[PDB]
């Protein structure tokens, strides 16, 4: 009933089959509750400001995400966060896309914008950078979390061990289906650096881009 | 070094990104040992005589495997096993393909090894098989490349069978995690429920399944 947009923040360094699968599982879960209609997915790669030494330039990560999504009919990459001239907090990215969602919807209930993350975020509060204490309440309260759990994640204990999460747990949606694609970008970077295969862990066009551009080779 | 062919037998009902990942991990492992040169991979779907209720017709399973292998330059699907009049034990499939390997001459003696996950390795060591002569022929004459599936202990499987223990030196344990922990059983259940299996299978396989109306209740 409620139209919803799923925003995924993170380094996407590189994007993998895990990140794409997260969108699919989350959309199925929200549709399965009966109360939501998922309209769009947004992949928002992190800004280069103060980035880790292993973080490749943002125009590469945007290009790889675009190649990864050419078989998707509902997820798009938005480079706005990465184009900003400063360090960006996730809550400000959500505010920006929420505003542009309210604008676009007026031209065509009112839509909602939710942050898509793994269950580990409920313990870590990093997407990919540690959120400020004063921003956690706004993210879980005004937007909400759609959490997909990898093996070994325990979202209900994470929510128990956090008073702010418990306070507003009604805006945290725990998807039930497993991720199965247990593929961190860290593993892919290590494998690439050691010359090991990453075929079938990320789309072939991303692998081709990585080789052509010489990324992730030490 | 010695040329090696990897053979995977199974239902492939449907093939998933897990099966293809297994081949890549196995080839990297063998190459890393320094003693082997992997020249080919063979996917061999099971005969329909086998025949559980949810086993789709072998024509479709080898069609889907062929579509999945379009982007591979070294793994092929061989429908020989599925075209025989009767189901065959794995060891007879190994015998057949080993003969084919020898006949395509030799660049030593090429070797043919069976590729499996640790869950199949588990099926080789239950106590009814501790004296089985086919299991022994598999590990003595061909050998095994085992890719570890999270939550399995291949070393204890090896130690619990006297046959596997005796021929442990022809059982190769790949170290890299599979990561694509995707069962065909999950995929069928999700397809029957209308759930997404995108990014769990090659896109052309999902398209074939949709176009053919497979796995729908």
Residue numbers in the entry:
A (entry chain B): 4 to 111, 125 to 234
B (entry chain A): 4 to 110, 125 to 234
List passages from the publication reporting this PDB structure:
Nicotinamide mononucleotide adenylyltransferase (NMNAT) was initially identified as an NAD+ synthase that catalyzes the reversible conversion of NMN (nicotinamide mononucleotide) to NAD+ in the final step of both the de novo biosynthesis and salvage pathways in most organisms across all three kingdoms of life. Intriguingly, in addition to the well-studied NAD+ synthase activity, NMNAT has been found to be able to retrieve the activity of luciferase from heat-denatured amorphous aggregation suggesting a chaperone-like activity of NMNAT. By combining multiple biophysical and computational approaches, we reveal the molecular mechanism of NMNAT as a specific chaperone of pTau. Taken together, these results indicate that NMNAT adopts a conserved pocket to bind both the enzymatic substrates and pTau.
Alternatively, we used mN3, which shares high sequence similarity to hN2 and is more stable. To identify the binding site of mN3 for pTau, we firstly determined the atomic structure of mN3 at the resolution of 2.0 Å by X-ray crystallography. The structure of mN3 monomer is similar to that of hN3 with an r.m.s.d. value of 0.543 Å between Cα atoms. The catalytic pocket that synthesizes NAD+ from NMN and ATP is highly conserved in the NMNAT family. The crystal contains two mN3 molecules forming a homo-dimer with a buried surface area of 1,075.8 Å2 in the asymmetric unit. Consistently, size exclusion chromatography and multi-angle laser light scattering (SEC-MALS) characterized that mN3 forms a dimer (~64 kDa) in solution, and as the mN3 concentration decreased, no significant dissociation of the dimer was observed. The entrance of the enzymatic pocket features a positively-charged patch mainly composed of residues K55, K56, R205 and K206 for the NMN and ATP binding. Lysine residues, K95, K139, and K206, that are involved in the cross-linking of mN3 with pK19, cluster around the entrance of the enzymatic pocket of mN3. The complex structural model showed that the phosphorylated segment is well accommodated in the ATP/NMN-binding pocket of mN3.
